[model samples]
Target: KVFGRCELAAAMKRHGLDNYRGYSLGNWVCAAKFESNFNTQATNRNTDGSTDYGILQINSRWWCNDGRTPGSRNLCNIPCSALLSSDITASVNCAKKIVSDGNGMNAWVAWRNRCKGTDVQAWIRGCRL
Candidate 1:
């Protein structure tokens, strides 16, 4: 986790999460809260009932079937150069791809504008995590 402050911010920006949540990986924490409740070892039930993997919820079985070589098209296919670098950015990008436009904040913005903050719900809404 050699993730520096600016590096973290840049990653968030790449994932289209560069807002107030961009201040920290706090947005990533929020994503965990919204995605799988922060279960690093959490597993989802696939159609075959096997399992995915990791803290960012990456699916190694499907994505890594080709093995650990670069561009393997497995659940771990990132740039060869980046493989030796911090993987946090890679994790963020992967998550972003699963969502529309790779922008989780867009979803949050949609929720905020459409249904989340309407009125007396402010007490529960304004202090969003």
Candidate 2:
């Protein structure tokens, strides 16, 4: 499921990620843009043979089971399909857990590469929280 930016922002607010793990909604919005372009059904194969899942592009190697990858830690304790749903409540919960584990949004390479140190105010402009 692809979502409009404002719609995504609203959902994030509703799911409690608007201010999650000491990060603001802008950070989440920017990460999602770079990771999966806000597509809930997004998936990508990594160079290391793991898959990235859902809007956050969470790695299968540590967070979820892609059913094809072995040795997944499944730290989120969920099927990859859980992250692929249009309703992002499960994804948000898992992401918060990940952030709390110390990586913060840096767990997402997109945040490190594309969003870090960038002014992301426009990512959530007019969303009104």
Candidate 3:
């Protein structure tokens, strides 16, 4: 399930992502856009055998347990599979945990490399939320 730009923004806001970690809704939308292109089932495998999951690209190395990440921290206490679901509630919840650690939205390398230090509003320009 791939969400439209505005749909993804609204879904994220509905789940409390708006300013949840001192970042705006635009930040979340921009991060997810680059991370997964708003696709719910997006996944990426790391060379170190870790994996990134869902629209936020939450990593299995620390945030979630994949049961095969070789000492996965499972910090969010959720299966990595949970992040791939279409509902996105679990993924959104885990994302909050990621930023709550004081890393802010920089927990995602995709965000750091792509969305950070830019005009994120462009990602949510027409989104009324």
Task: Give the count of colliding residue pairs in each prediction.
Answer: 4, 0, 0
lDDT computed for candidate 2: 0.87
| Residue 77 shift from truth in candidate 1, angstroms | 1.7
Report the CA-based lDDT of candidate 3 relative to the real structure.
Answer: 0.88
TM-score of each: 0.36, 0.95, 0.95
- Candidate 1 accuracy as TM-score: 0.36
RMSD (Cα, Å) for all candidates, in order, is: 8.8, 1.0, 1.0
Off by over 4 Å in 3: none
Give one digit per residue, the lDDT tens place, for model 3 in 13-56: 89998888678888899888889999989999999899999999
Most accurate candidate by lDDT: 3
Model 2 regions lying over 4 Å from their true place: none
Superposed on all Cα atoms, model 1 deviates from the true structure by an RMSD in Å of 8.8
- The window of 10 residues in a row where model 1 has the poorest summed lDDT is 120-129
Q: List the residue pairs that clash in candidate 3.
A: none
Clashing pairs in 2: none
